[PDB]
Structures are given as structure tokens and as C-alpha cells.
Design a protein around this nucleic acid. Structure first.
Length: 113
RNA sequence: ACUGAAACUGUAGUAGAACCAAUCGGGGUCGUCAAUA
């Protein structure tokens, strides 16, 4: 039950039961208000191409390339010892990959050498 | 060349009105560490 203050002013205007406005006719308007504000203030020709929107969507959605999510490690299997740093030292001596941009959805290699 | 007597500083009046002990915060999570020879 969402109303503007004019709708609440009508609600408090009576002790009798009164119609509530159907927010479901307005939800698209409000969401588009948000989307047009994001486009206009952050300089984009689309809402879903705003970088923080594009990134945030990928987070909620996950990664479509079916590479597994796990912390970096040198073996595809998680070894029973806390030695995942071995990937990072291999990365430091290897290709020295940065964490890929969330929008780009690029997976790390298990050997960053 | 005679002490006055006797007479309750009491009677009425609410230390009270107003004020939210409150505002913000996912019980959460990943890269090494160490300095010589």
C-alpha cells in the first residue's frame, strides 16, 4: 500500500474505509523515473549500459560462462591445505592479472603463469 | 499607694506543564608470511 501525501491526506480525511490507489499501475512509472535519472545524470545512452548498473546486474545474475566461482588456487580441486596464495604468487611472477571488471565477466586461469 | 485579664500567625493553594533515550551499522570474510647471503 503505497500512496503520495495527497493520497494519505485523503486516507486521514476519513474514519470510514476508503479506496486505496493501485500502486501496480504506477510501479513502471517509478522504475522508469529511476532509470531515466540514472541515464541522465550518469551520461549514458541506456540505463543498462551505465557501468554501475551493468556491473550490479552481473552480480545479481552471476556468470554465464559456467566457470566455477572459487577463490584463486593453483589446482582445480581445493587442496585440503590453505595454500591458495600459491596462485597469487604465480600471478605475481606470471601475467600479473588484475581482478577482471565485473561487467566483462572474464574468468581467471588456474595457471596465471 | 501595688504586674491587667483573656486571644493558635493562622486560613485557601498538587512543584507542575511539555519532551519517543533516540539516530546510523548484513555477525561478516582469502592471499601469503619472513629477510637475508
Amino acid at each position: 500500500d503505497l500512496r503520495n501525501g495527497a493520497g494519505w491526506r485523503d486516507y486521514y480525511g476519513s474514519l470510514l474505509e476508503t479506496s486505496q490507489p493501485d500502486f501496480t499501475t504506477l510501479i513502471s512509472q517509478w522504475i522508469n523515473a529511476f532509470q531515466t535519472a540514472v541515464k541522465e545524470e550518469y551520461g549514458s545512452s541506456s540505463f543498462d549500459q551505465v557501468t554501475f548498473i551493468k556491473a550490479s546486474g552481473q552480480s545479481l545474475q552471476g556468470f554465464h560462462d559456467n566457470a566455477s566461482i572459487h577463490y584463486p588456487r593453483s589446482t582445480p580441486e581445493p587442496k585440503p591445505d590453505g595454500e591458495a596464495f600459491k596462485w597469487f604468487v604465480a600471478n605475481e611472477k606470471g601475467r600479473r592479472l588484475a581482478l577482471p571488471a565485473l561487467e566483462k565477466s572474464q574468468s581467471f586461469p588456474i595457471k596465471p603463469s
